[PDB]
Ligand binder design. Structure first.
Ligand SMILES: CCCCCCCCCCCCCCCCCC(=O)OC[C@H](COP(=O)([O-])OCC(O)COP(=O)([O-])OC[C@@H](COC(=O)CCCCCCCCCCCCCCCCC)OC(=O)CCCCCCCCCCCCCCCCC)OC(=O)CCCCCCCCCCCCCCCCC
Ligand code: BCL
Ligand code: BCL
Ligand code: BCL
Ligand code: BCL
Ligand code: BCL
Ligand SMILES: CC[C@H]1c2cc3[nH]c4c(c3C)C(=O)[C@H](C(=O)OC)c4c3nc(cc4[nH]c(cc(n2)[C@@H]1C)c(C(C)=O)c4C)[C@@H](C)[C@@H]3CCC(=O)OC/C=C(\C)CCC[C@H](C)CCC[C@H](C)CCCC(C)C
Ligand SMILES: CCCCCC/C=C\CCCCCCCCCC(=O)O[C@H](COC(=O)CCCCCCCCCCCCCCC)COP(=O)(O)OC[C@@H](O)CO
Ligand SMILES: COC(C)(C)C/C=C/C(C)=C/C=C/C(C)=C/C=C/C(C)=C/C=C\C=C(C)\C=C\C=C(C)\C=C\C=C(C)\C=C\CC(C)(C)OC
Ligand SMILES: CCCCCCCCCCCCO[C@@H]1O[C@H](CO)[C@@H](O[C@H]2O[C@H](CO)[C@@H](O)[C@H](O)[C@H]2O)[C@H](O)[C@H]1O
Ligand SMILES: [Ca+2]
Ligand SMILES: [Fe+3]
Ligand SMILES: [Mg+2]
Lengths: 259, 39, 41, 277, 49, 43, 318, 43, 42, 43, 40, 44, 38, 44, 42, 43
């Protein structure tokens, strides 16, 4: 054997071409894996064709893979058929690609940044089968680190600076110990609502929790929990999505543009 | 997940295909040997 | 199944061949012209 | 066409500039003001590169070979002024278009982030890559005093630039910021393989097993290296490693020539000449 | 073999049709590239005629 | 031709057309500026 | 500003988690777990416990022997002067056998120690690979990590063992030292005509660059949607939440296409793995089937040509 | 042949066709300019 | 042509037009500066 | 031997085996081409 | 699994004949290539 | 000895064995092709 | 995974192993005749 | 001595042993090949 | 009981393991006798 | 002695001791092979 395959072809040239064929197959494989969610696409192409043309692009979809959930929570198929969901919005113009304007109060529309899918109405579970996100009042073995302030008792302040409530309890993740939610006693109504840690900016000196997402008045409409001591995956999405809607809807100037 | 009866049929065809593929291979190696022996 | 009716398959195949041979005929003429211009063999 | 869950997210507003003028989608892409600006910045820059390839260094050497196409910066004698189009001026125009396209891409990402109500980590992270490019073609050439210090626009020609810039300091491996940046690049790749492996091995476990848990994830690397950073923190670490690699790479090149002209191994003479030894 | 037709009971015939056509196109392209790379069989840069 | 605006929406189409025309206009000027025989700024 | 979720503001403490129970008959995990406040600021506070089984013990014993041999030879290279050891530490190295020894075992200070350090380090790395395989197996997990580690080991073996054996010379291998192995890296590229023109070196860089690009993309993406629980990616894979949807929608709007919460980790896995796969291939091709990479690039029309503004009379053409 | 518009969406076809033709026109002009035998701006 | 303002919002168009005009003016000045015969700072 | 197919899937084995045989055939052909004594594409 | 038995037989009929047509054209091309420039 | 395969899965063990045997066979063939004394493709 | 499957596997495994070894020996015997390595 | 199998699992001891012998065999074969007086592929 | 094997089972494994080990050592000894005749190393 | 197995696990001790002995045995053989005076694989 030798390095020269022909007068021009050599082993290194063959090796690099061999990689291109493998890499092409790898990209096709990866794109097919990418398409296990959200495909076939929601398209006008399908709509005018009466559903006779499924928009998948290239490569086409893969055969459904099986996710067996722990604790007999069920089995999900990664490529799955999903029922169409109506949107609480209307197009701002009739051309394709035009955005939609939410209907009613945008913070309550469940559209745009306030939209969320309906997840399972079951709590995420620890390896031992207990609910994962729970208040500190039921996860008695958990505690706040000594060097960090206790969130409980802190004043919750909305985006406008007005006081929204106080922190009654802290919800922790029992698998990876960390704060995920802050239970707020709303100043107006008194009904407890959850506040995700991702929307909470701590002011350690002032003992204040600043929520730039929504105003103090918006806290009254935060989606509530069925059971007081646990939260389902469905409820988690509903709560987080509501605060996210405030990043665009809470104040009129947040819609933009800047100039 | 494949039962025994369809296993009996598969092996017969596979052996026939392997024997057919082997036979072409043997002729090609004979022709290659006549063209340019390597050993 | 591709969502097509069985009569659509007959009808598509006929038009597909007509367009394919028409394309092939232009190609053959092009190669005859190209061969007369500069033969490669 | 949108994802089957996407329609409920295609909201009006959230633009930085333009309001409703360009607030629409073209196929999958969001356009906005900076989609229009970015696209035609890129389109012009791409066409000028093709035009730069059409005339080549000269008519004799002109090539459309994708490896060999090269739009070169001006000669150093042009300083920080503008050069004639066929003598590096085209490179200067393409660089401006590239900056326009890259920044518009980042700003379009900001508008998308506002629409979706997510953190601005992605455009912030992309700014580091833009900053590295700006260091290479703007900050460093200005510190050196000539636009000709920028790298040529060519798939292989800019490797010759990297090679020769490195050998302008006789052994570029000894650049301390370069060593730090490579360490971050190598660690990031290791962390990425680890994170990709752990997620895949947990959600695609052995046959006959259910999907594993976050407890399995922490246990696995505790069992291997005695520590688990956590599901959230690995993404902090991956972002930190990638951004630190680019930051230190930008530092390493901007000190190579503007703030250090000697061979890089000689820089370590401060340590060798410590009076302790 | 009187039962070669049974290959189409286990694997989807549509996938074979595209796979065979894609594979043959690649194989045909590769062999042409190999021959062009040879001075002996290069029909574009041989001077004949 | 006027049905085309029932196929291509004016708002998105006009934005694409004007930018493509402007980029095309810029490219041709740049091509001429790069050509010594037609560089009107050569003096 | 809004909480960027870069640092944990308020940390939570629980009893140390022993870890998911191992199969019956396995050795217990060692180390009493402790909590580090600063580790918990950026990540998890718990440090330990670790599983140190039979395979890990052998890897440690083999690994220490290799490391001790390297450090001893570095100390010997400065004639036992520990002060000069510290001064020159970055420059010191255990250096591979001389070219005239081929693949034979040379005397201790002429490459013999290097071979022992190379063998012992290789054994410890191989034993560590078995440990990563066993740890995944003991938890019922797939072997993605051990495959990715094997790819890195393939590159490591290509550098110090496979290429030197194919060239029939231990002198081709990498010195055990900080600056010495950087000198080797530069000299390798110089010796074989500018490794920039090795296409697998080009590919390795594209994947190394892509690894940083993807982890920056994915790391920023997860942090951007961590306000929706995007960090809990298992949940988002089995039960797609708004975090995965917004993550995918962001990237679809940005660049016209997107991954899923699971498939992004397949892109990540392959990008990092291909970095060392193509690195190994590029090394194995260099000096064996290609002598001068730049001249190989010229032959295949990869190297650009520049106008001749400067040139040298060749003194050998006299 | 008017039935091709019952299988192919005319809007997407026209977008793909107009885009390909514009790129093709640029490509052919660029090729001619790269050949000194056909660069019409050389004098 | 007054109807173009029923397609494109005027207050948004003015900002876009200002940027386009400024960016075009910048480019022309730079092109002139790249030409020695018309570089006014030589 | 006929009872092998109980564990090994007939379908995935064929594609795996055909793919293996194909790259094996390429490798052997390419090795011979690299050998001047067996390259059939030279003079 | 999917395709039934009768259409499996019929598919082979067009598959075998079309492949044979491809093979025959290949043989003719290789006969022409051998006359053009024999390689052995 | 008849008590070997009650623990090792027939499918896994053959898959691991077949891959290993091919690699060993490939390695040995390549070593011989690399040795001028046993290269059968070199011309003599 | 039971006795009537595991024992059945071993039997065929033996005569398949011996067939491989028998071919391997003949290959090595012929290899010795062609070029003895010892 | 038979009671060593009550402190080491045969399956885990067997696979570790098979790999250990394979590596040891490769190591010794490579050492002999690397030693010019014992390389059997040199032909002399 | 750290493995979970009774006295009979450890003894039973040891009976076959020694037989398999002894045969392996038997082939190894023959290989070394043959190797020594080919080329003694001492 | 006999109590050394009361504070040391027999399993961890044995694998560690055998690991050291195997590494030590390899190291001594390597050193002897490195020594020209004791390389038994020479002439
Ligand atoms: C080793 C590393 C380097 C290797 C080489 C790398 C080289 C660089 C790579 C560059 C990649 C650039 C392309 C990226 C995507 C482009 C954007 C896009 O449209 O995507 C859609 C495209 C297909 O989308 P889809 O989901 O199948 O579409 C669904 C239907 O098609 C939807 O149906 P539809 O009806 O919407 O179909 C139409 C669709 C069809 O889309 C396409 O055909 C475009 C794709 C072509 C390629 O049209 C579009 O998507 C674009 C619409 C544009 C409209 C405006 C037109 C303006 C022109 C008019 C001018 C007239 C004057 O997605 C991709 O192609 C993804 C490519 C991923 C490449 C990654 C591999 C390279 C990186 C490797 C490193 C990573 C580590 C690996 C381990
Ligand atoms: C090197 C010496 C000769 C030469 C020697 C040979 C030899 C020998 C062969 C070819 C063959 C081919 N050559 Mg030639 N060929 C040369 C130069 C060229 C040039 C060029 C511009 O220089 C081109 C474009 C081609 C192109 C071709 C293809 C037509 C064909 C392989 C296509 C294929 O992979 O089918 C695979 C892909 C498919 C989709 C096949 C489909 C099969 C169907 C079912 C059968 C009926 C076809 C049906 C109508 C579908 C249309 C597809 C047609 C193949 C177009 N050759 C030089 C001049 N060439 C091969 C051939 O004849 O194949 C037909 C072949 O054996
Ligand atoms: C001068 C150089 C001489 C040479 C001189 C010596 C001298 C002197 C010694 C050896 C020893 C050994 N030599 Mg020597 N040896 C040479 C060439 C070789 C070659 C070769 C291919 O050239 C090989 C493969 C060997 C191999 C060996 C080993 C059999 C042995 C080291 C085992 C060990 O480290 O255990 C450590 C690793 C372990 C895992 C130990 C635990 C063993 C098992 C697990 C416990 C079982 C208990 C059992 C019931 C009791 C019997 C113990 C048995 C060793 C099994 N030698 C050359 C020719 N060799 C040593 C020896 O004889 O040890 C037995 C020794 O003292
Ligand atoms: C030796 C070099 C010769 C040359 C020799 C040849 C030869 C030989 C051939 C061509 C062919 C082509 N040449 Mg020429 N050609 C030369 C120089 C040029 C130059 C130039 C600037 O110099 C250009 C622009 C072209 C361009 C072309 C294209 C028109 C055509 C390839 C089309 C294609 O790929 O369709 C592929 C893509 C499609 C078909 C998709 C389009 C779908 C259409 C719309 C289907 C409609 C259905 C319709 C009713 C039926 C089919 C009819 C046809 C499509 C017309 N040639 C030089 C002078 N050329 C080929 C040809 O004639 O093809 C027709 C061909 O065989
Ligand atoms: C080299 C020799 C000549 C030359 C030889 C040729 C030849 C030969 C041709 C051209 C053609 C063109 N030349 Mg010229 N051309 C030269 C120099 C130039 C220069 C220059 C600055 O030097 C420019 C700017 C041009 C520009 C042009 C374009 C007007 C045209 C290609 C259009 C196209 O690709 O549409 C494709 C893009 C689209 C279709 C997208 C547009 C989408 C729009 C919204 C829809 C329009 C479709 C419409 C309904 C129907 C189209 C036709 C209508 C009746 C107008 N040429 C040199 C001097 N040129 C071609 C032509 O005449 O085409 C008509 C052509 O065949
Ligand atoms: C070096 C000297 C000779 C040469 C010597 C040899 C020797 C010796 C051999 C080949 C073989 C092959 N050669 Mg040759 N060959 C040469 C040059 C070439 C050139 C070229 C352009 O130069 C080409 C394209 C080929 C091509 C080929 C292939 C047709 C074949 C390898 C196929 C394969 O890898 O199977 C892998 C892919 C598969 C196995 C997929 C399965 C495909 C088949 C159709 C399976 C069907 C099973 C069965 C037949 C079904 C029907 C059963 C009945 C219905 C009962 N050779 C030179 C000129 N060649 C080999 C061969 O003959 O194989 C057939 C072989 O042994
Ligand atoms: C900072 C950490 C890493 C990083 C991060 C990062 N990159 C990013 C992002 C982030 C967070 C994005 O959000 C953004 C994106 O959307 O990615 C999909 C992006 C991106 N990073 C990209 C590439 C990229 N990133 C790189 C590096 C990195 N990116 C870092 C290692 C590299 C390297 C190392 O080479 C490349 C090539 C793009 C895929 C994308 C930005 C796309 C963009 O800006 O689109 C607009 C522009 C065009 C479509 C074309 C513009 C063309 C010009 C007008 C002309 C050409 C000019 C250019 C100088 C030519 C040079 C060519 C030669 C060098 C060959
Ligand atoms: C090592 C230092 C930590 C440590 O030593 O923790 C050990 C855990 O086990 C162990 O080996 C654990 C061994 C691995 C611990 C080191 C892992 C890296 C250190 C943490 C890095 C955090 C940041 C990572 C990068 C983002 C405990 O071992 P012991 O001596 O039994 O207990 C001593 C303590 O209880 C204090 O009295
Ligand atoms: C606690 O430790 C103490 C203090 C006691 C001693 C510590 C000393 C220190 C501080 C040492 C520091 C060492 C450093 C900094 C080392 C740096 C090493 C680097 C950067 C190495 C980089 C690359 C090296 C590579 C890639 C080497 C690869 C070598 C291989 C794969 C060689 C394999 C060789 C084999 C398998 C040999 C085979 C031959 C057989 C037959 C054994 O030979 C007889
Ligand atoms: C380029 C990337 C984006 C950055 C944007 C800014 C681009 C450059 C800013 C424009 C500055 C132009 O400034 C102008 O430059 C040219 C070219 O050097 C100078 O020209 C001067 O030097 C050049 C070469 O050095 C000589 O050929 C010329 O004789 C002399 O007059 C002009 O005296 C100066 O007026
Ligand atoms: Ca010819
Ligand atoms: Fe992740
Ligand atoms: Mg050195």
């Amino acid at each position: 054997m030798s390095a020269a395959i022909t007068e021009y072809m050599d082993v290194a040239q063959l090796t690099i071409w061999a990689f291109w064929f493998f890499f092409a197959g790898l990209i096709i494989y990866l794109r097919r894996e990418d398409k296990r969610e959200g495909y076939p696409l929601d398209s006008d192409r399908t709509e005018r064709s009466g559903g006779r043309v499924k928009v998948v692009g290239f490569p086409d979809l893969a055969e459904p893979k099986t996710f067996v959930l722990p604790h007999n929570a069920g089995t999900v198929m990664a490529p799955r058929v999903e029922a169409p969901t109506s949107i609480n919005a209307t197009p701002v113009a009739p051309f394709p690609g035009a955005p939609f304007e939410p209907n009613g109060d945008p913070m309550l529309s469940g559209f745009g940044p306030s939209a969320s899918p309906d997840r399972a109405k079951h709590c995420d579970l620890t390896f031992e089968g207990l609910p994962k996100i729970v208040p500190l009042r039921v996860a008695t073995d958990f505690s706040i680190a000594e060097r960090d302030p206790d969130p409980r008792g802190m004043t919750v302040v909305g985006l406008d600076g007005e006081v929204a409530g106080t922190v009654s309890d802290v919800w922790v993740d029992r698998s990876e110990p960390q704060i995920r939610y802050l239970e707020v006693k709303v100043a107006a109504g008194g009904k407890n609502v959850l506040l995700p840690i991702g929307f909470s900016r701590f002011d350690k000196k002032a003992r204040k929790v600043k929520v730039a997402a929504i105003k103090a008045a918006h806290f009254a409409n935060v989606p509530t929990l069925a059971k007081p001591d646990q939260i389902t995956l469905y409820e988690e999405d509903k709560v987080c999505a509501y605060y996210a809607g405030g990043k665009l809807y809470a104040t009129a100037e947040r819609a933009g543009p800047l100039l | 997940g494949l039962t025994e009866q369809e296993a009996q049929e598969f092996h017969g065809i596979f052996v026939q295909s392997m024997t057919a593929f082997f036979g072409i291979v043997v002729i090609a190696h004979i022709l290659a040997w006549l063209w340019r022996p390597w050993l | 199944m591709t969502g097509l009716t069985e009569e659509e398959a007959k009808e598509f195949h006929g038009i597909f061949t007509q367009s394919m041979t028409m394309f092939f005929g232009i190609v053959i003429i092009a190669h005859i012209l190209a061969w007369l211009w500069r033969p490669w063999l | 066409a949108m994802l089957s869950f996407e329609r409920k997210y295609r909201v009006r507003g959230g633009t930085l500039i333009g309001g409703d003028l360009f607030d629409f989608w073209v196929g999958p892409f969001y356009v906005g003001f900076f989609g229009v600006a970015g696209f035609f910045f890129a389109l012009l820059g791409v066409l000028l590169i093709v035009w730069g390839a059409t005339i080549g260094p000269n008519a004799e050497l002109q090539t459309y070979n994708i490896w060999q196409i090269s739009i070169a910066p001006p000669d150093l004698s042009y300083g920080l002024g503008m050069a004639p189009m066929t003598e590096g001026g085209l490179w200067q125009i393409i660089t401006i278009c590239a900056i326009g396209a890259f920044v518009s891409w980042a700003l379009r990402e900001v508008e998308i982030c506002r629409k979706l109500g997510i953190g601005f980590h992605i455009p912030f992270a992309f700014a580091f890559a833009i900053g590295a490019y700006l260091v290479l073609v703007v900050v460093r050439p200005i510190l050196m005093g000539a636009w000709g210090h920028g790298f040529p626009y060519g798939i292989l020609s800019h490797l010759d630039w990297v090679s020769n810039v490195g050998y302008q300091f006789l052994h570029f491996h000894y650049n301390p910021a370069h060593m730090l940046a490579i360490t971050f690049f190598f660690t990031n790749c290791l962390a990425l393989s680890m994170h990709g492996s752990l997620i895949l091995s947990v959600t695609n476990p052995q046959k006959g097993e259910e999907v594993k848990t976050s407890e399995h994830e922490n246990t696995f690397f505790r069992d291997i290296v005695g520590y688990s950073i956590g599901a959230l923190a690995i993404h902090r670490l991956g972002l930190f490693l990638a951004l630190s690699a680019v930051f230190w790479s930008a530092v390493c090149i901007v000190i190579s020539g503007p703030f250090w002209t000697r061979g890089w191994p000689e820089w370590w003479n401060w340590w060798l000449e410590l009076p302790l030894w | 073999s009187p039962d070669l037709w049974k290959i189409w009971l286990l694997v989807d015939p549509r996938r074979i049709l595209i796979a065979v056509f894609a594979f043959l196109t690649v194989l045909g392209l590769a062999i042409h590239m190999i021959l062009l790379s040879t001075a002996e069989f290069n029909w574009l840069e041989d001077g004949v005629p | 031709m006027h049905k085309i605006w029932q196929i291509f929406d004016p708002r998105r189409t006009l934005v694409a057309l004007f930018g493509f025309l402007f980029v095309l206009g810029l490219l041709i000027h740049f091509i001429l500026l790069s050509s010594p025989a037609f560089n009107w700024l050569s003096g | 500003p809004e909480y960027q979720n870069i640092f944990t503001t308020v940390q939570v403490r629980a009893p140390a988690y022993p870890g998911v129970p191992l199969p019956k008959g396995s050795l217990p995990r060692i180390g009493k777990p402790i909590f580090s406040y600063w580790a918990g600021k950026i990540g998890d506070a718990q440090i330990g416990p670790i599983y140190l089984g039979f395979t890990g013990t052998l890897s440690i014993i083999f690994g220490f022997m290799a490391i001790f041999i390297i450090g001893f030879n570095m100390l010997a290279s400065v004639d036992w002067n520990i002060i000069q050891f510290v001064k020159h530490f970055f420059w010191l190295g255990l250096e591979p056998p001389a070219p005239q020894y081929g693949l034979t075992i040379p005397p201790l200070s002429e490459g013999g120690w290097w071979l022992m350090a190379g063998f012992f380090l290789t054994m410890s790395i191989l034993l560590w690979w078995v440990r990563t395989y066993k740890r995944a197996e003991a938890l019922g997990m797939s072997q993605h990590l051990s495959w990715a580690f094997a790819a890195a080991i393939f590159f490591y073996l290509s550098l110090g063992f496979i290429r030197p054996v194919m060239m029939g010379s231990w002198a081709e291998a990498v010195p055990f030292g900080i600056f010495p192995h950087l000198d080797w890296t530069a000299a390798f590229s110089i010796r074989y005509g500018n490794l920039y023109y090795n296409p697998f070196h080009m590919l390795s860089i594209a994947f190394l660059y892509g690894s940083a690009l993807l982890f920056a993309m994915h790391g920023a993406t997860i942090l951007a949607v961590s306000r929706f629980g995007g960090d809990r990616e298992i949940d988002q894979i089995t039960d797609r939440g708004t975090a995965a949807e917004r993550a995918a929608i962001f990237w679809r709007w940005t660049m016209g296409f997107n991954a899923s919460m699971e498939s992004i980790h397949r892109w990540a896995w392959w990008c990092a793995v291909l970095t060392v796969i193509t690195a190994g291939i590029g090394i194995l091709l260099t000096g064996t089937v290609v002598e001068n990479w730049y001249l190989w690039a010229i032959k295949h029309g990869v190297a650009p040509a520049y106008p001749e503004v400067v040139t040298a009379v060749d003194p050998y053409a006299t």
